[model samples]
Target: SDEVRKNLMDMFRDRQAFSEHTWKMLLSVCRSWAAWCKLNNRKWFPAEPEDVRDYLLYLQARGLAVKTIQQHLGQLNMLHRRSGLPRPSDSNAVSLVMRRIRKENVDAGERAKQALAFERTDFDQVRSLMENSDRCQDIRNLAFLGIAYNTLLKIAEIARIRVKDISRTDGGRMLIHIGRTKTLVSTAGVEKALSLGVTKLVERWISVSGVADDPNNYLFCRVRKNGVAAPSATSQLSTRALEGIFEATHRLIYGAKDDSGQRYLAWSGHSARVGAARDMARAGVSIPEIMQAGGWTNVNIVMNYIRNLDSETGAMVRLLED
Candidate 1:
């Protein structure tokens, strides 16, 4: 409906934009358009055939999900184009994008490969380095590292956890009862987990820092020591911070390496996910189990990580040959 598009343009402060943000803008616009048209005699956005064809191409080039483009097509055909808008229909575009999606063939060259994955040995090294840094920030750093690596959580997820999520149950594995997950799945489908390593480090940090077990309290709070801020004090340890932290910590951890033969550490959040994926596979966990543990919505993401990990875990092959 043109009325809905009008509302979107109004919401967007009365502007014509075919920007990369079209996806988000169009989502709201289309929803409003559908409702408006239904109530006001089924009207929609009127567009030229050339513009319609170009817009579909614009969506594909942006690497948007096929389903996303499909939804856009639905709204275009139903609300706008159906209402006498001259939209150019290139059936080939639909066929091509859907075929690509159905095959699950994403461009691998575009995605950066995993860097350094934290092995058990790497964790041991990081633990020792941070614990002996002579600063409270070090402890906080160590806590974050453990939580990420042990739980195989995304940096945002790990950072979002509250102290209350870390819990102890009578004769059970140490548990983390997370209230918010990335995907809003059912209680059975999501939430409520346990990882001994993550729990142990967090508990240790809690005992040391004396942070109250309040539900609202952030698990990794402000790092203050001796009436002064550590280097990380002025800047909060946010989602962005986690990315930099992994990179910096990786370099530092590698610098401390005494083994002259060993290569330097090159870690990122991707490593956290991929390394954990590989570790799980090596432990005889199935792909489904790995996918569930990593909170992945699609197995393709998990499978990509698994494929790379399998290929790069070459040291084991050397051992087998020996």
Candidate 2:
């Protein structure tokens, strides 16, 4: 057991390190499984396939969605594999049970609700609000939203952006090198371009945000309580911060309070990506170009993001007169 523990720790510390949030999620999943095993007087270490299947089924009975259930199984598989033990998830029985659960959910009309898109019109509205503002916060927010929309990057990708990753071309357009992502994990880099207006917004943010001349610093850092972005090398903007930025901008463009006073702006990090996809789809951008622009490796995922606009601008309407 000591040998296995040591090896697992070594893997995490060296070869197979996971991100902080993902690691915490894995720990939580493992703890839940351990608790379930303890309650049933069953072994958790080297977990039995049948036991895991039963546990997943139990979770489904408790109304856990297929995504959450799959995540639990993924954690188990990763933990067991990292520990040099055969994962229960590798078994055919475990796979079948998971598939059945997903199918049942689909049959029952259960689905994951997508984030509300922030389209080109929404971007224009936000720009109109912030473009006239003199505050560094407002300028940075405007630029942040601009880059988020134009690049169609994930919130994490946008947050991870560094000043050094940006470079201007001879044609006045700018190129941003993405060193990390959910799909590609490397410095090999994926480059995205920004329009002239978007490029100028970033330039204005640089002048106002008061970040140091150091190029290594993050492109979007945390603003202080005093309404200024402090010149600290350490305090980079986080994914949650990016989400809040979107929500705040959404409120500015829309309203702080709804008719019911519930204070609603139903969106998240993926909202920009979704919005960009929908706008592109409506503009009659090809599926391949959309995938390329969004740095999407899969066609189906991007298709889903733009699926809602189908009734309006989708191929079915091509049969109608323009």
Candidate 3:
């Protein structure tokens, strides 16, 4: 009991020392947990199981996105079992809420939104902006869009690519090494590949744009003035940088805007992947092509993406012809 207590304190410190964004995430759950305990007249030290779910419903009712709710649920579940606590029984409240969330998602068709697709017009607009982007951001944005479309990569995976992880194929084809994916089956080993479309884009862009190409560097770099020395840092592009690029392009191309006066895109980088997949499907690309290029090994998961295209897409919802 003493060791467990000490470990919990250590976890608290570790969670604090995590990056600011992650720290905020853990803090949100911890605060929600603390409030839950106080409301139930239970100890604040170790929260009860189902109370976690009750807090979740509280947040959900307040209009948090399902993905955000899921994120908080994940952190809570991990802390319960990993912060030197006893086995979290399967029958606990946290588990029940998770199951309930899944059923609610299915019954209400929320899953359809998760795999939401974009239209051919939007995709072409993004691609065209990428084409017209004569600046360094333009080339990089174009390359990223091409890869996101051709490869169907998650934004996280796209961010993970290092310069070394990309290279020419034996046949001189440009390639994406595809080192790892966010899946369990590939736990033991990451997947790798070289799609022709991605490969050629890299070569042409690098040659024409004259951006840095140290194999040790990230595939994408920050925009800089000509001859300006870059900082001693990792990632040529910050996560925010990539996001900003997407947001900027979305505003420029679509005339979309956020709540603020600034123009906006309706979605994020992952939208590129989702949109690309749908674009291919709408153009009549084979199912096998979509699955193989996107690194989705499961037929069912791929099917869900395809189905979502038909069900939740803007054009599908907006078209008067359909």
In candidate 3, where is summed lDDT lowest over 10 consecutive residues? 227-236
lDDT ranking, high to low: 2, 3, 1
Tell me, by TM-score, which candidate is best: 2
Candidate 2 ranges beyond 4 A from true positions? 1-10, 256-265, 312-322
Task: List the candidate 1 regions with Cα displacement exceeding 4 Å.
Answer: 6-116, 171-173, 185-198, 224-237, 255-265, 297-299, 312-322
lDDT of 2: 0.83
Model 3 alpha-carbon drift over 4 Å, by segment: 6-24, 35-42, 49-54, 65-71, 84-112, 115-125, 128-133, 184-200, 208-213, 225-233, 258-265, 280-289, 311-322
TM-scores for every candidate against the unseen true structure:
0.60, 0.87, 0.72
Candidate 1: residue 231 lDDT (0-100)? 26
Model 3 per-residue lDDT tens digits across residues 1-322: 7877787788777764455666677778778767767887877556555666677777767756577777777666566676676433345676777667756766776542542344456656676656665666566677776676666777777677776666565877656666553343344544445466556556656655444446665666655666232422275566666666667666676665757743223556666667776677777877787777667677777676666655555775668766
lDDT of 3: 0.63
Clashing pairs in 1: 1-44, 2-44, 49-88, 116-266
Which candidate order results from sorting by TM-score in descending order? 2, 3, 1
Overlapping backbone residue pairs in candidate 2 total 0
lDDT of 2 at 175: 90
Candidate 1, residues 1-322, lDDT tens digits: the string is 6766665455456333334345465666576545645564543445344444455455667775555666666656543443444333435555454455535524433333455677666777888767666466666677778777666877766666665565666755456655444354356533445466556666666666655445556666656557233222223357777776677787785544345643324677656666777788878998777877877768788777665654465798899999
* lDDT (Cα) of model 1: 0.60
Q: What is the C-alpha lDDT profile of model 2 across 1-322, one tens digit per residue?
A: 8878987888777744567777889889989999999999999988899999999999999988789999999999988888988888789899999999999998999877677888898889879878899887888888988898999988888877777888888899989998875558876878899999999999998878866378878888877767777655566687888888878776665666456733224556788889999888878899899999988888998889866655643566666746
